[PDB]
Paper text:
Human UDP-glucose dehydrogenase (hUGDH) catalyzes the oxidation of UDP-glucose into UDP-glucuronic acid, an essential substrate in the Phase II metabolism of drugs. hUGDH is a hexamer that exists in an equilibrium between an active (E) state and an inactive (EΩ) state, with the latter being stabilized by the binding of the allosteric inhibitor UDP-xylose (UDP-Xyl). hUGDH forms a hexamer arranged as a trimer of dimers, with each chain containing a NAD+ binding domain (NB domain) and a substrate binding domain (SB domain). The active site is located between the NB and SB domains within each chain, which are both flexible and undergo a rigid-body rotation to open the active site and bind substrate. This remarkable conformational change is controlled by a buried allosteric switch (the Thr131 loop/α6 helix) that responds to the identity of the C5 position of the nucleotide sugar bound in the active site.
Unliganded hUGDH (hUGDH) was purified and used to prepare electron microscopy grids for single particle cryo-EM data collection. Processing, refinement, and image reconstruction produced a 2.06 Å density map which revealed that the major class of unliganded hUGDH is the 32 symmetry E state. Analysis of the particle set with 2D classification shows that the E state represents ∼60% of the particles, with the remaining fraction appearing to represent dimers or monomers, which is consistent with sedimentation velocity data showing that the E state forms a less stable hexamer than the EΩ state. As expected, there is no evidence of a nucleotide sugar in the active sites (not shown). The cryo-EM structure also shows that all the NB domains are rotated 11.8° to the open conformation. The cryo-EM density of the open NB domains is less ordered than the rest of the structure, indicating domain flexibility. This is consistent with the various crystal structures of the E state, which reveal NB domain rotations ranging from 0 to 13°, depending on the unique packing constraints of the different crystal lattices. Additional evidence that unliganded hUGDH favors the E state can be observed in progress curve analysis, which shows that the unliganded enzyme no longer displays the hysteresis observed in hUGDH:UX4O. Since hysteresis is a result of the slow transition from the EΩ to the E state,14−16 the lack of a lag in unliganded hUGDH indicates the absence of a significant EΩ population and is consistent with the cryo-EM data we have presented thus far. Here, we show that UX4O shifts the ensemble toward the EΩ state, and that unliganded hUGDH strongly favors the E state.
Author numbering:
A (entry chain A): 2 to 382, 390 to 466
B (entry chain F): 2 to 382, 389 to 467
C (entry chain C): 2 to 381, 389 to 465
Amino acid sequence: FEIKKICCIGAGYVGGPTCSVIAHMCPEIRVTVVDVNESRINAWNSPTLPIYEPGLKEVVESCRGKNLFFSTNIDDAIKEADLVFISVNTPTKTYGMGKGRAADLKYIEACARRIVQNSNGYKIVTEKSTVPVRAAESIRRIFDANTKPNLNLQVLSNPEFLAEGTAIKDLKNPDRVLIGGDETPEGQRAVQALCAVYEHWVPREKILTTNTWSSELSKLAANAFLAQRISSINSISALCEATGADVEEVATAIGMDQRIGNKFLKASVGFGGSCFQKDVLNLVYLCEALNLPEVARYWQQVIDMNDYQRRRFASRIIDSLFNTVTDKKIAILGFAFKKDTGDTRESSSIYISKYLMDEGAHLHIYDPKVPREQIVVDLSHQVSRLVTISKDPYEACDGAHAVVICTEWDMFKELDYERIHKKMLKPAFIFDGRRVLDGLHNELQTIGFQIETIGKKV
Amino acid sequence: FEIKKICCIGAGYVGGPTCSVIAHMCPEIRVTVVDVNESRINAWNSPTLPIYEPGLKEVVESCRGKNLFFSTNIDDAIKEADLVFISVNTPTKTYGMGKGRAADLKYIEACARRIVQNSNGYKIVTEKSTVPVRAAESIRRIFDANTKPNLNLQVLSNPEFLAEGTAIKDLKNPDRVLIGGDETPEGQRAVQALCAVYEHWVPREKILTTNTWSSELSKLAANAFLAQRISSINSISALCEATGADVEEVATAIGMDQRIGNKFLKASVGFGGSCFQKDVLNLVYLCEALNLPEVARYWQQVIDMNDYQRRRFASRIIDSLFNTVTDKKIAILGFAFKKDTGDTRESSSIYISKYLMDEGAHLHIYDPKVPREQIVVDLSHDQVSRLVTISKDPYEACDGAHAVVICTEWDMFKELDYERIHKKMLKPAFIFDGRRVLDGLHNELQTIGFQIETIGKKVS
Amino acid sequence: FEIKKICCIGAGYVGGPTCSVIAHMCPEIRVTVVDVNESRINAWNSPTLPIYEPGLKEVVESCRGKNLFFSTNIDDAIKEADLVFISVNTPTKTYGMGKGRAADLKYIEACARRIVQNSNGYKIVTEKSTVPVRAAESIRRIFDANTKPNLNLQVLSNPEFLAEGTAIKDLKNPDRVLIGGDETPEGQRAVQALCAVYEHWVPREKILTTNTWSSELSKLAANAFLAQRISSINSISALCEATGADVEEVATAIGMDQRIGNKFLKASVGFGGSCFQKDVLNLVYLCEALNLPEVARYWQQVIDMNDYQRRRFASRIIDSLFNTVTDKKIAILGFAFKKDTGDTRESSSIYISKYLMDEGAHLHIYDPKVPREQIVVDLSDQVSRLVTISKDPYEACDGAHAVVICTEWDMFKELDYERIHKKMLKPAFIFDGRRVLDGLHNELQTIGFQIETIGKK
C-alpha cells in the first residue's frame, strides 16, 4: 500500500505546517488540509497565511494548488484520503474529573466519529496532536463499534515535536520522527506506509517506530523531562542564594558533563508556554488514574518547584519593598513566556504580576511584542485600577520603586539604567528574573541600583 | 605563583590516581602522596598497587621515584608543599544531627588542623574529595583561628569527577576541571596557580573557575541531576507497565531530543553505587538546614522514586509467587551495583534480596565478580545463614528454583542456557529481568515456557 | 545637642496626648502636632478636642499657644523640628502576604519619605506608634537611600504604653519610658537627647534605654505576655467547669504568689480591644517570617485559647437552649470589649453575638455606652432581621429565654432580676461571661434562674 492522498483534519499550527512540509517534500502525494473555520481556510488560501512561520509562505505557495490544498469539505477529503491526520487541539478539561489536568478528548472523538462515517475501504488514521496516553484505544473502540463491511481503519500515533517560530526547521530536519502502531501485522503495514512518506526527506535512522502507547507516552515524557531540567536548576538557584553559590556557575559546571548536557539548564523565574505544565499535569493525572501515586507525586514536584520559584521571586520583591507595595509603582519588563514571541500562555510574568497585584502594586508593564489587549486579558478574571501598559521601558520605570525583568528580551540588556535610576524612587531595586543583567551588576550598583537576581546571593 | 611541590593527604581512590596523573603530566612538579595506612603507603611503593585502575601502574611506575613519592611523613610533606590536596574520605554521619544524610567533616577538620600546625609561609590548600557545601568556610575558619605571622593559607575547591575503573581516562581527558576560590584578588592568584598545573595537559577551555561555594555545589548537583534522570525514567517504567508502553522505546524516543540526551536513560531496578544516593541525601540535608523545605522535598523524590522502584520490583516477584516465597528457592543473578565491578555499595541487589529474605525466601546468589564474603556482609546485620546460599555458577543457583531474578546487567546472563535452566526449575518458572538484559529473548524464553517479567514492559 | 523643637506627625490618641504632656512638662520646648485631617487639627485648636481623655483639656489649654501648636503645615514643622515623632497608625494588612496579621508600614514609609524630603541638618526621628520589629531598619534604609549633604537623621524607637481613658495618668507617671537607638556613638547621642526630654518629669531610673530592635520587640512582647495571662486563666476556667473548681478561687490563690502577681488573672469570655490580639498576631507573623515555627505556634495558642473561650461560651448557651435558638429572643447585656468605654474593637460580645446569630437567634442587645450605629456595623440582611438594639436592659430581657452578660458593666450587678425573671420565658437562663453576678447566684437560683458562668461547674 502506497499513501497517495493525505487529509489533515485541523488547519492549526500543527496540521498546517506539517502537511505543508509533506506536500513540499512529496510532490506526488496529494495533501488536503481541512478545518471548520472558514476564516482559517480562506486565510490559508490567501497571500497572508493565518499563522506566521518562517519559510511556511515559501513552502505553501510553491505547493498550494499543485498538491497542497485547503478546503472546508471535510467529508469529501476524508473519503478520498489514504492517510487521515487528526490534528485537532486537545484542550485541558475545564470541569469534572481531571479538571485542569486531564485532556478533553471531545474533539478527537468527534473527529473519529466523522472519519468512520465518511470512510470506506482501507485507511490509516494518525493522531498528530498531543493526546493522553491510551487515547488511540478510544479511537479504535469508536472504529470497532461503527464498523462497516470491508472498512479497515488502522490507527497510528505520530506526535509532533515542532516549536513555535522554528516549526519549518524542525519539520525539515527533525531530531526524530516518532510513529506508533499496533504490533499486529496489519498495524506494521500502516506504520511502514507512514514511514515511507517521511522517508522522502527524513533519514530512516531518525524514524523511530514503536507501539502506539509508547509513542503517546514519549511525547508527554519528553516535555516532562525538559520541564524537570528547568525545575531542577531552579531548585539549585534557591540553594545558590542561600549558600553564596552562583547558579550560572553551577549550571555551566553541570552542563559540561556530557551525560547531562548543557541545554535547558538556565535558571529563571519559571518555565512557561502551553506545553510544559500541560504535559506534566497530564502525566500526573494519568498516573493518579492508573493507581501510581508515587509516580504522580514525583512529577508533581516539577510543577510545585516551578510554582515555588515564582512565589519566591515575588516574595523577594515584596520583602525588599518593606512588605508593602500598596500604590507603589513597579515596572514589569517583559510579559511573554520567553523572548522573541508574543505568546503569554503560562508566562511567569502573569503570575509575578498577579502576586504583586494581590499586594495592591501599581504595575507598569512593558513588552516589545505582546499586544496591549493580551496583557489585560491575562491579568483579568483590579486590572483597571492597578495595571498600566507602557509604550516604552522608560515610561514604565519613571517614578518606580522596582524594575522587575520577567522575560529575557535582549533590549533590556541595553537600557539606559543611569537614566532610569534618576527618575526612580529611592531605594531603587532591579529584580532580574532571567539573569539577563549579569556582567552589569557592577555598573548598576555604582549607579546606585540594588540588583537582585535568581540564583545569586544578595 | 608557581606550584612546584604538591602534597596530597590521603592515598586512596581519589588522592592516588589524581596525583599520579599530575606527576605524569607535570614532570617538573614534585608530588608526594601521604596517608595514615602503612600498608597503603607500602602497597603504593610496591609492584602491586593498593588499588587497581587501568593505566595506573604504567603512570605510577613511570613517575615513582622521579617526581611522584608515597610516604607516611605527613608533617614533612605538608611543610615543603606549595599546594596541599585534602583527599580524605568524608563518610556519612552515623549518629546525631543529620544521621544518614549529612557528611562527617571530622577527617577534613583533622586534616586542616594538621596542615595549619605544620605550615609556614604561603600555601594553597585544596579540597579534592566530595565535601558538603560551605565546608571550605570551616577550613578557612580553622586557618583564621590558628594563624601565624607571615602564614598565608589559601583555600580552594577542586572536586574530582573520576569514576572507578576509568579514573585514568577521566583524569587525562576530563569533561571539565572545576576549580573554586575566593573572588578576592588573593584567591584568584591561588586559582590561577592551580589552573596552571592543570594546563599542562588540560585545555584552558575545559578548566572552569568559580567561587568556592559554586564549585562545592556543582559536585553535588551533577550527581543529583544524573540520579534524577534514572529516577525519572524509572518512574516512566512503572507507567509503561500500567499502559502497555515500553520504557526502552520511550527512552530511545526521549533521548533523541538533543536537549535531553540519550545518556543515563536506562530504566533499571534502581541506581546504586557510593555516589548518587549519598550526594542527593546530602543535598536534601543541606536544603533542610538552610530552611528550603520545597527544594529538600523536590530532591527527596529522586531517592523516594529509587526506593519505590526496588520495592515495586520485589513486590512483583512476591505477588508472582502467590504472595508466599517461604522456603522457596530463588536465584539472584548479579549482586554488584552495576556490571563489570565487584562494588556492592548501595546495590539494588542488596535491597531486592533483603525484601525476599523478609518473606523467608531461600536465595541462591551468583555474581561472577563479587566475592562471597562481601555478599554475606551486605546481607548481614542467623537470617543470612539460614536463607542465603552463594552459588558458584548460575546453573547451580537456578537448579530447583521458582524464579530467576536478574539484578545486575552482566553480559554473561544474556548467554545462559535457559532451556537447560528451565528443565530443572520448579513450575511455573519465572524470570524477573530487572535490567532489561533479556530483551529480544522474550520470544524464545516464552516458547521455552518462562513467565518472563521485566521492568518497564507490561506483563504479556 | 538639646531638643528644642518637636514635631509629631499624627494627631491621634498617641501623638496628641503624648506631645501635650511633653509641652506641659517642658514649657521651653516648642511642640507642634501636625496631621492631614483638617477637622482633627481644627478640633485640636477648638474648645472641644477631637478625642476625650481625662485631664487632657487642662493640659492642652495650659500649653496651646505658648509652646504647644497644632497645624497642617507638615513640611514647615518637619524642617524646623529637632525631634520628629512618627505617630501614624499602622493598621493590619488587608491583603497579600501577612493578611490579617502583618502590619502595614505604608504610612510609616510615606512619613519617612516626607521627613527626608523636608529635612536638613541634624534631626532625631522617633517611632512612637506600635511598629513591627525591624521597622526602624526600613526607615533608616529610606533615609540612607535619600541622603543629602550634611543631612544626619537619627532613628529611635520610643513605643507608647498609654491606655485609653488613662492616657494622661500613664504619661505623667509611666511604669517605664522605653527608648531604643543604635549602639553606635551617634545613636547614643540621639538616645540621650530624647532621654533629656523625658527627664523633665520622668525619673531617670524609669527611663530604660535599649537598642532599637529590643525596644520594638518589648512593646509587642508586653502585650503578648498580658494576653497570655488572660488566656492562661481562661484555660483554667474551662478546667474548673470540668472539675468543680472555681476559677476565681484559683485565680486568687495563683495571684497571691508574688512571682505571678494578682493583675490580669480575671477569667472572662475572652480578651478584646485593638492591642492584644493585634500584637500577638504580629508576633506570630514575625516568627513565621523568621523561620521560628516553634515560637510562632507557641504564641498562636494565646489567640487560639481566646477564640476557644468565646466559642465554648456560645456553645454552652446554645446547648442550654436545646441546641436550637432559632427565633429565640436572647438578651445580650454589654457590647463593649470592657466596661466603662464605648470601644467595641475585638469585643467578645461581637463574636458571641455572631455565633448566636449563626443559629438564627433574635438578639436584643443593650450597652449603656456603645452607640446603636456601632453595634449594627460590628454585627454587619442578617443584622436587620435578627438584631434588635434595646433602650434598657429590661426591654432586652422581656420575653427572652436567656440573658447573656458579655461586658462587666457595674449596672448589670444591680438589675432587678426578679422583675426580669417574671417576663422571661421558662426555663430562664443567665450566662454570666464576666463573673459579675458572683454572690448573687443563691438569690438568682431562688428566683428561678438557671445561672451559668465562666469557670464554675
